[PDB]
Design a protein around this ligand. Structure first.
Ligand code: IH6
Ligand code: ZN
Length: 259
């Protein structure tokens, strides 16, 4: 039965200078409110999900710290940063290579990252191939590096400890802002990875239903529209993975739900 004291994954949420400018209209309060609202709607999905299809419910996400980067991190030659002005590795792209950004962000946020269940990056960058978000997959194993619950690994190159309790979401795709309902689902799904779910097996009918049965679930490998019933829910495939992970990791790094 869930532990009321250990039922919530507290977030560090970062809005880099891009999201701030283009989603928050250059306003800190606007940016802050947007993401408080976003995470709150993502939390409705999680909290209301029964991972064992019965009483293993109530588990959610809350922001512990929001950080708004009103300004890019200035960079001289031969040095990089996730919230730097320029994209990496190609300068002449709208966006970073998604995997390198997640990697960069995790290195830069390392000191903060160790203090929280999860760290999440919000950005406004048009990644190639319609890519919208990325995150490390959690696991019930104690040594797992990735997903819920910070676990140090030393980077000899980085000259410090890193935590892969992280993920990111962009609200820009094919040259435009995505829909609010799309953004909610990008974050649900990345946090879903963090929480331990791999993508749904697309040829398995129970975990990838046809439209007439409510459509695909949120861990479907191709961005869902959010128009169909199942789009905002977790498949049984996702439940079984996330359940195991929560069952093991809640005692480690989950906290009490705050008002
Ligand atoms: C709208 C919506 C939705 C559900 O969440 C998603 C988040 C990212 C992607 S993705 O960026 O399109 N993509 C799918 C192919 S594998 C790759 C890593 C490229 C990525 C993903 O699954 N990230 O978690 C799709 C759905
Ligand atoms: Zn995914």
């Amino acid at each position: 039965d869930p532990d009321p004291m250990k039922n919530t994954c507290k977030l560090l949420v970062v809005a880099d200078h891009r999201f701030y400018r283009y989603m928050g209209r250059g306003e800190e309060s606007t940016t802050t409110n947007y993401l408080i609202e976003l995470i709150d709607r993502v939390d409705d999905i999680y909290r209301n999900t029964a991972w064992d299809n019965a009483g293993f419910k109530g588990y959610g996400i809350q922001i512990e710290q929001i950080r708004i980067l009103k300004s890019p991190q200035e960079v001289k030659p031969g040095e990089k940063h996730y919230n730097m002005a320029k994209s990496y590795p190609n300068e002449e792209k709208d966006a970073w290579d998604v995997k390198m950004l997640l990697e960069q962000f995790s290195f830069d946020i390392a000191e903060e990252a160790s203090k929280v269940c999860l760290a999440h990056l919000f950005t406004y960058q048009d990644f190639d191939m319609g890519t919208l978000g990325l995150a490390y997959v959690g696991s019930p194993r104690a040594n797992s590096h990735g997903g819920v619950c910070p676990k140090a690994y030393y980077s000899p190159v980085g000259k410090k400890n890193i935590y892969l309790n992280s993920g990111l979401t962009s609200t820009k795709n094919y040259g435009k802002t995505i829909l609010t309902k799309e953004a909610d689902l990008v974050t649900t799904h990345e946090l879903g990875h963090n929480f331990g779910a791999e993508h749904d097996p697309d040829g398995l009918a129970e975990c990838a239903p046809n439209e007439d049965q409510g459509g695909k679930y949120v861990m479907y490998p191709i961005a869902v529209s959010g128009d169909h019933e199942n789009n905002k829910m977790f498949s049984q495939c996702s439940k079984q993975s996330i359940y195991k992970t929560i069952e093991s990791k809640a005692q480690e790094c989950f906290q009490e739900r705050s008002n």
